[PDB]
Amino acid sequence: ESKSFAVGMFKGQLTTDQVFPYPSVLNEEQTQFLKELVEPVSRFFEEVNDPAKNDALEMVEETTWQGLKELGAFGLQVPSELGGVGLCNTQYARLVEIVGMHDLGVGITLGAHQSIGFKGILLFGTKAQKEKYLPKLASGETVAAFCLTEPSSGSDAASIRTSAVPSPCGKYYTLNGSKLWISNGGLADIFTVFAKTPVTDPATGAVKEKITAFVVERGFGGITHGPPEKKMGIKASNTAEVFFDGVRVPSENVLGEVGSGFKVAMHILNNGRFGMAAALAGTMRGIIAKAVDHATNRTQFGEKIHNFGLIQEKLARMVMLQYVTESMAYMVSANMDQGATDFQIEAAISKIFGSEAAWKVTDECIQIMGGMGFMKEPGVERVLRDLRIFRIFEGTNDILRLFVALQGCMDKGKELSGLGSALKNPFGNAGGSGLSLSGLVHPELSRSGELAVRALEQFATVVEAKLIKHKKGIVNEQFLLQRLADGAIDLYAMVVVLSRASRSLSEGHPTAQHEKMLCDTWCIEAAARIREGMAALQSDPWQQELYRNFKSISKALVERGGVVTSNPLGF
Amino acid sequence: ESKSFAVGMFKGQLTTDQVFPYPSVLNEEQTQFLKELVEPVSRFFEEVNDPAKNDALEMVEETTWQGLKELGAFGLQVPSELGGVGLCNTQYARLVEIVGMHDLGVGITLGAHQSIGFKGILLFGTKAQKEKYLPKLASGETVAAFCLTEPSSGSDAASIRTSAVPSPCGKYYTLNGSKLWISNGGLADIFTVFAKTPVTDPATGAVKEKITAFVVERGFGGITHGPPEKKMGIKASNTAEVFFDGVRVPSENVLGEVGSGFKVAMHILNNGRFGMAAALAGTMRGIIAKAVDHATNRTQFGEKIHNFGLIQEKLARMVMLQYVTESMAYMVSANMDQGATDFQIEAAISKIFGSEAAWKVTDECIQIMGGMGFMKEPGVERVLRDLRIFRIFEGTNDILRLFVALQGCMDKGKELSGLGSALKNPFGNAGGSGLSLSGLVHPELSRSGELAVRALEQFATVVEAKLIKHKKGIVNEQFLLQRLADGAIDLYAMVVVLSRASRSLSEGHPTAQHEKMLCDTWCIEAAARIREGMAALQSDPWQQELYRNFKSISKALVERGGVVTSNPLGF
Ligand SMILES: Cc1cc2nc3c(=O)[nH]c(=O)nc-3n(C[C@H](O)[C@H](O)[C@H](O)COP(=O)(O)OP(=O)(O)OC[C@H]3O[C@@H](n4cnc5c(N)ncnc54)[C@H](O)[C@@H]3O)c2cc1C
Ligand SMILES: Cc1cc2nc3c(=O)[nH]c(=O)nc-3n(C[C@H](O)[C@H](O)[C@H](O)COP(=O)(O)OP(=O)(O)OC[C@H]3O[C@@H](n4cnc5c(N)ncnc54)[C@H](O)[C@@H]3O)c2cc1C
Hints:
2 copies of one chain form a homodimer.
Chain A: H1 5-10, H2 28-47, H3 51-57, H4 62-71, H5 89-102, H6 104-117, H7 119-124, H8 127-139, E1 144-147, E2 163-166, E3 172-183, E4 190-200, E5 207-217, E6 223-225, E7 239-250, E8 254-255, H9 261-297, E9 299-300, E10 303-304, H10 309-337, H11 344-369, H12 371-374, H13 380-387, H14 397-418, H15 446-470, H16 478-506, H17 512-538, H18 543-560
Parallel strand pairs in A: 1-4
Antiparallel strand pairs in A: 2-3, 3-7, 4-5, 5-8, 6-7, 9-10
One flavin-adenine dinucleotide (FAD) sits between chains A (112, 145-149, 154-155, 181-183, 231, 239, 389, 392-393, 396, 398-399) and B (298, 300-301, 305, 308, 310-311, 367-368, 370-372, 374).
């Protein structure tokens, strides 16, 4: 049985192995080594990098770029014996939180390189591939890029058109295609490329086109790139089209198994996903400091504005979002470091949650700052511009919601359809829930623990009813799936903060009473959202009218090409 | 008694004079004259103005600027006999919807000039002031600016420090101060300036400092400005500090009455406010066309994406927001044109609603577009950058919510405190709601009309209970006031669309059944938000715990200077 909390909750089970107690993974030497890196990495971003300059120049300044290579920042998770820093996922999370606090354009360049660009070599490379490629990737002598998206294919990776055709000898493949919006596409010398190949069925020999992943060197020939694309934010990161024209790729440069490229791509994206939430937890930490500074020092209506309830509630909401996001990021990284094999729903939740949280936190920082927040000099508007893409790339949040909902439903649907389905033998065959977090949550958080268990039961009841009603047709019920994904996001958020705050209380940390407050305040409102949301799905007699009207209104818009009504004057 | 719907709803009354039937104000000649302007103004924005170029140059191109003057666009509401186009508020709304659809940087420059910059001359000018100043304002030979904000004072206008001191003869005032973030500050030759003056009490002679408004000419001497400030969006608009150093202002340049400058400022802002919603209804119309075009033509997962429910719901929500905003804008403009004196709550609602709606619509257009939406070339990201300021200037939306809530409570609180308060004479003194929209809403919208009446009753019940509980101390209950303002916004939104769609049904317009659908879909969810929101205020036993925790969490953040917790590792 799965050890995933998210898998269990869709079945009405409390599977807590990967949640409680809040995981601690580093040994004493790993902790001290990480401390000795945090200091120089922080100083580098404080004293050498200039995020406003990189945004103005639409590139990373050369002194910063070379300094990052010397710091080891292009190879943080590459083993030391292969030229890297040798960090585990939790150690990586700690350093990317520094990068995300300071410069998301630098962060995307380093993440595109190592979180996804060569990550497939770390996960699937042969010994020969690792030894050949990793040392120069880790030094930054060869930058990497993840080459999946094409003009025709973004969310639907299975539809890619770039092709790789084997030679008669089988010594190489000829690769033809183009890729779109590739981070580092104009800088990279190593590309992880996904392309359709003919794959021979091992039993019958029948040939079917399937995706295969390849390690491609720019020096193989036939590779060019377009100019840097101009964009709203993360302007220091390079984004370019990459063109492959008759590229000879050696057969030993297949990454993983021929015809398993889709799984390779998905595993790379899943594996890298926690780093987003970690970086964005850092973004939020720096933004909250700026908002608090402003509210501490601005007088209006005769008081400093932190004395006004509207500002107090904005600040409290911002820190709860940062705390949830940070807690999710380090939970997933710890699960990975502890050998979890089923964390993909939790990782997707962390990416949706953290990207939307950082957006909302930075938008409210602008609001607290007033007119100043819209100005260029304070730098907050630059962060807001940078953040908009994080809801779109590495999986749009809309598609990730559908993934969360359907992946969570999958095992429950398997169980339900197992019911019945045995043949009947007529010839004489002889043959509350009890759920509780007591003993896992700290006693001072018992009430919020009970809110989480009740919300889990409400959620699982709706999941079951909807799978019985829709069966395999649930895949087409998108209004429903988005609402189930939101319930799942809030439920995981509740248990992550219950777990972290409980450990803080048990260990007597100085901030434990504050963390208990963050947790209870989060849980009261998250439990209300799950209660109201699940009632709308199950017992609301107007919900189906809303769904029919969303479809009818959208159809009317598409027929017209835009708004159907004129203004009230009619012209 | 007030004819305002918003005033009535806080008292549990249905005051419908300014709502039903949806107002029609233009006579046949005004309609034809407006049609003859819509065509050349639209062509000018389609064929002459280039919004991407003005954003790149951080100014309005000279050919566009001169063309706008020749079009009459600097004087749209100035009477023809004073050199303007002579439009009423509804006619103005129609043309600013064109500007807002095409270029919000141009829109803010023209609005800062005429919606607020010289608007006080139209509202309060003497005959001599109007004849002297309006002709060159209307031609654009003299650009105007509204000079209220200072480094110390934004939301709290009463706290301004710029001073104007009368001469011994009383022939002039000497003006000293500085103003911050003034739209057109570096371009204007006419400034509406708010400054503190000594004001003599007419009965006793005692002198008190109060604000006075002045018409100030750049040529009076002593006026300089700072360089254009760089900002996230509306980059074509000029924003500059304005400095007043020993400026001699003739006494006949007082605008309105000495010591009534705060009221003048507030009346100017209130009077101009509907133009924001009108412009932003146009912004949303153009953005919805772009989103619909994208969803019509993008194939993913084997279908055009408008076939997927997630996209259908996003599109349907976007058009409902555009329709509500547009309907509010033309309702308020019509009320003004029909001589309403009490429309300030409705105008503030329209500004909060329309600015937040346009932000949300444009953010979702980016999401529908995927990666393309983050790129510069499509132009959507530029619109999103432009829109962020509209939640802040002309009154921050947070302060406008407090205004809506407290202004609505004011007459109800007056009524309640009248209860009792008569002396008792012990010596022998002898001496459902019924509310319905039936007959006002169209019969096909009767159910949504009943939802609105029930929501009004729920709202008014809470307003009464909270005024009894808090009395004059309600001014300090900001968490509550923000939630009451949200209820008021949704209630006005419901009645505005019920009124517009009812007229469409009664008149048999071709889009009436579609409008009925927009209205019912809006009303079902708005009624649910008011039901749940009012229950949280009245009958929820955890609401007070949330409020206490928002204050405690914010206090802990201010004490620390930022997030209190470390990350889970503790360093
Ligand atoms: C700055 C930048 C950097 C990038 N870096 C890289 C990189 O390094 N490597 C890489 O390979 N790619 C990269 N990308 C591409 C990025 O991952 C894609 O933009 C993303 O996957 C979305 O694809 P799309 O833009 O084609 O949108 P589409 O997939 O066409 O989606 C359009 C919209 O429809 C929705 N949608 C799609 N299908 C469905 C469905 N079945 N049901 C409901 N809704 C649906 C989507 O959520 C979205 O809202 C980058 C993009 C940008 C902008
Ligand atoms: C591009 C631009 C153009 C502008 N154009 C002009 C112009 O032409 N003329 C002009 O006069 N001004 C103009 N302004 C100034 C603008 O109106 C002010 O920025 C606005 O009034 C807010 O004031 P502030 O920035 O001082 O914020 P503050 O008033 O200091 O507010 C800071 C924050 O605290 C909140 N807040 C304040 N008081 C309270 C309270 N009592 N309770 C709860 N919350 C509170 C606010 O809502 C905000 O979130 C412009 C500004 C910009 C950025």
